[PDB]
């Protein structure tokens, strides 16, 4: 994965 | 209770703040009253094209990507709704992804049943209404996607839940302790029990007549898991047999080695 984690890190 | 009654309204808020449309609004648009201007109904290719010219490949494939844009928007809202859950942001960065990997769609279908009825569902922020029979019309395998959801939504809507109930339900769907690959299976399980506890107490207080609404919802949770599994199966067929249907990166990432 790469997205999601790119989101959680907000 | 102090926390149990407070935490229930905090998750409720995060629901309303992050989720529009909700059920109270979907029930307003439906059943007439306080509206008078019904939504544009889509029951054939004619009405479908009229609704497309006002929004900016095969018809079945175009409807596909239209639902992908909503799935993607919902998953984003779910990620924001999840962070507002007491303990989700405290979990491991990878355990947060897993809870959302197996839970997003299981929640999307639960919430989808709010804007559905035996005849159709509301699309485009309630301004439209697509009939069930029209979806069964489309060619396969597309005609089989939405149909199972209508069936779940019908028996689910029978329980007559409101947004306060659904909010806690969705939160529980995300805080599932038996997801494949969960690291701290012990911490999430405690968090899951806390959520499930409030949900149970909330139902016993919000529906004192339906004394078994709690186990029923549990059943529904198992139904949703099965309903996602089959959906993910039908997604693979569409990804491998339809040459003009391309999955979204965020959507392809979630199904990646799911079931």
Numbering used by the authors:
A (entry chain B): 687 to 696
B (entry chain A): 200 to 255, 266 to 468
Please share text taken word for word from the publication where this structure appeared.
PPARs belong to the nuclear receptor superfamily and the ligand-activated transcription factors; they exist in three subtypes in mammals (namely, PPARα, PPARβ/δ, and PPARγ) with considerable amino acid identity (54–71% in humans). The ligand-bound activated forms of PPARs are stabilized by associations with specific coactivators, thereby enabling the regulation of specific gene expression. The carboxylic groups of the PPAR ligands are known to stabilize the AF-2 helix 12 through hydrogen bonds (red dotted lines) and electrostatic interactions (blue dotted lines) with the four surrounding consensus amino acids: Ser280/Tyr314/His440/Tyr464 in PPARα-LBD, Thr253/His287/His413/Tyr437 in PPARδ-LBD, and Ser289/His323/His449/Tyr473 in PPARγ-LBD. When compared to the LBPs of other nuclear receptors that have 600–1100 Å3 cavities, the LBPs of PPARα/δ/γ have relatively large (1300–1440 Å3) cavities that are able to accept 1–4 ligand molecules.
After some trial and error using various cocrystallization techniques that we applied for PPARα-LBD and its numerous ligands, including conventional cocrystallization with multiple buffer sets, cross-seeding, soaking, coactivator addition, and delipidation in order to remove endogenous fatty acids, the PPARα-LBD–lanifibranor cocrystals were obtained by soaking the PPARα-LBD–clofibric acid–SRC1 cocrystals in a buffer containing lanifibranor. The structures of lanifibranor bound to PPARα/δ/γ-LBD were solved in a monoclinic space group P21 at a 2.98 Å resolution, a monoclinic space group P21 at a 2.46 Å resolution, and an orthorhombic space group P212121 at a 2.29 Å resolution. Obtained structures were identical to previously reported active conformations that form the Activation Function-2 (AF-2) helix 12, thereby providing root mean square distances of 0.60 Å (226 common Cα positions in PPARα/δ) and 0.53 Å (212 common Cα positions in PPARα/γ). Lanifibranor was found to locate in the same position of the Center region in PPARα/δ/γ-LBD, although its benzothiazole moiety in PPARδ was flipped sideways when compared to that in PPARα/γ. A previous cocrystallization study located lanifibranor in the “Center” (for its benzothiazole ring), the “Arm II” (for its 5-chloroindole moiety), and the “Arm III” (for its carboxylic moiety) regions (yellow in Figure 4K); however, in this study, no electron density was observed in the “Arm III” region. Our structure seems more reasonable because the interaction of the carboxylic groups of lanifibranor with the four consensus amino acids contributes to the stabilization of the AF-2 helix 12 so as to facilitate the recruitment of coactivators in all PPAR subtypes. The “so-called” PPAR pan agonist lanifibranor indeed activated all PPAR subtypes with EC50 values of 398 nM (for δ) < 572 nM (for γ) < 4.66 µM (for α), and equivalent efficacies (13.3% of the maximal responses for α/δ and 24.9% for γ).
